[PDB]
A = this chain, B = another copy of it.
């Protein structure tokens, strides 16, 4: 009575994992300044998005098991190291350093934060050598027992960032290949995991900026109508808590020191960009955030935390528990200069049962860094000539809890930056990848003519 019929091209998909290629705008591609990320090799982007609204369909989303972040983690790290192969390697910089304190124009808060080290260096001709000097931050030199040496010498040969290639993030779009589709969740109240009543499909995601930072999400996408809190398991303290501000808060960071670059001709065709005498006063770098606005956003953050942790408990914020400068401080870069800010002044407040000071955060500066927490992989950032001042606004936080020894009356949240992927789940939480299954068989009373 009933007979099968096979249909080709039906709308059926199932969750699947695949490699998504790159699509980018024409800004970097046309300028051809060779940003640290290979946007030139990235395919040109489409003229405009091709969103389709899928009606009556609900899909299950899970940002914690999403593979799009993992591939993004692999690709960006691979691109970062690929930009370091061409330019010079600072293997001969590992020698004895004769360092003395700088005192010409030093301020009390920055008494001994940098050193003036002189060392013997090679030159263009192999049989000769030159005596040169440079200014090194205290965080990059260690006493031998005066005599100093670079921190990286007993770790690995240590390469320098190439001055020409920039570090500023450039938006990158991820697009699925043929036979695959990307689903966007448009539910405004969508938390970390759960069904999304409103679903749409796109061929390419919106421009994601590879901003790298800790304890603070900068230059990210903003939430709408509410501050959103997401975590894999709220009752488990081992899981970090992601927060997304509905409105941004601006932060002004600067490096007032007006220092000069000094190129040193090491080896044939290679150059080491040292730091010369500093012009004017020597003062530490710092970042500003308005006190009035920062308190305002924390009030909205506390309101949502009340929903999950009871609307009568005490919410308290405390600085980092402890660790090395990489994670215990707000790491980021500003105009090619890497920063490490002391955020103790921000997470210092208590909320119980419920004049523009412009809080200032002192920040250190470092030359030799391990960006991806890898051991033995440098990127020595050459000094940036002049004065640095960049403006960005925060769009989220990464928090962790502690305690909870059955005294469910006080809660403590502290910053966390353990995993670099967490800076990127906040942007890809709304996307998932599926593959199409065009083949389908259904019953119908039809038979072939023969």
Determine whether the beta carbon of B127 is less than 8 Å from that of A120: yes
CB pair A268–B155 under 8 Å, yes or no, is yes
A145 interface hit (Cβ, 8 Å): no
Query: Per-position contact with B for A143-162: 1 when CB-CB < 8 Å, else 0?
Result: 01000010011111110000
Question: Count of chain A residues with Cβ under 8 Å from any Cβ of B?
Answer: 26
Complex Cα–Cα for A124 and B153 (A):
6
* Given A96-B127, A127-B96: A267 touches B149 (CB 8 Å cut-off): no
**Which residues of chain A from 133 to 177 have any CB-CB distance to chain B below 8 Å in the complex?**
144, 149, 152-158
How far does the Cβ of A132 sit from chain B's closest Cβ, in whole Å?
13
Q: Is the C-beta of A307 less than 8 angstroms from some C-beta in chain B?
A: no
- Docked-complex contact A269 and B126, CB < 8 angstroms: no
Which among A124, A156, A270, A376 has the highest number of chain B CB atoms within 10 Å?
A: A124
B155 touches A95 (CB 8 A): no
B92–A152 touching, CB < 8 Å: no
Contact of A156 among B96, B153, B269 (CB under 8 A): B269
Is A2 part of the contact surface with B, judged by Cβ < 8 Å?
Answer: no
A154 and B124 contact, Cβ closer than 8 Å, known pairs A269-B376, A376-B269: yes
**In the complex, A91 has a CB within 8 A of chain B:** yes
Q: Are A268 and B124 in contact (CB under 8 A)?
A: no
Please name all residues of chain B whose beta carbon is closer than 8 Å to the beta carbon of A149 when the two chains form the complex: 124-125
User: From DSSP, what is the main secondary structure of chain A's interface residues?
Assistant: loop
Contact mask for chain A residues 20-39; partner B; CB cutoff 8 A; 1 contact, 0 none? 00000000000000000000
Complex contact A95–B125 (CB within 8 A): yes
Report the Cα distance A127→B91, complex, angstroms. Answer: 12
Residues of chain B contacted by A155 (CB below 8 angstroms):
268-269
Assess the A91–B153 pair: CB atoms within 8 A: no
CA distance A376 to B88 in the complex (A): 13
B96 & A269 in contact (Cβ 8 Å cutoff):
no
Most chain B Cβ neighbours within 10 Å, of A92, A127, A267: A127
The residue that A124 contacts in the complex, of B94, B128, B270, with Cβ under 8 A, is: B94
Given the known interface contacts A158-B268, A376-B269, the answer about A95 and B153 at a Cβ–Cβ threshold of 8 Å is: no
A90-145 residues with Cβ-Cβ distance < 8 A to B are: 91-92, 94-96, 120, 124-128, 144
Additional pairs, 15, CB under 8 Å, beyond known A92-B126, A125-B149: A94-B126, A95-B126, A95-B127, A96-B125, A96-B127, A120-B127, A124-B149, A124-B154, A125-B144, A152-B268, A155-B268, A155-B269, A156-B269, A157-B268, A157-B270
9 residue pairs, one from A and one from B, having the closest CB atoms: A156-B269, A157-B268, A95-B127, A94-B268, A95-B126, A153-B268, A124-B153, A96-B127, A155-B269
A-B contact pairs, 27 of them (CB 8 A): A91-B126, A91-B267, A91-B268, A92-B126, A94-B125, A94-B268, A96-B125, A96-B127, A96-B128, A124-B149, A124-B153, A124-B154, A125-B149, A125-B153, A153-B268, A154-B265, A155-B268, A155-B269, A156-B268, A156-B269, A156-B270, A157-B267, A157-B268, A157-B269, A157-B270, A158-B268, A269-B376
Name A residues whose Cβ lies closer than 8 Å to a Cβ of B: 91-92, 94-96, 120, 124-128, 144, 149, 152-158, 265, 267-270, 376
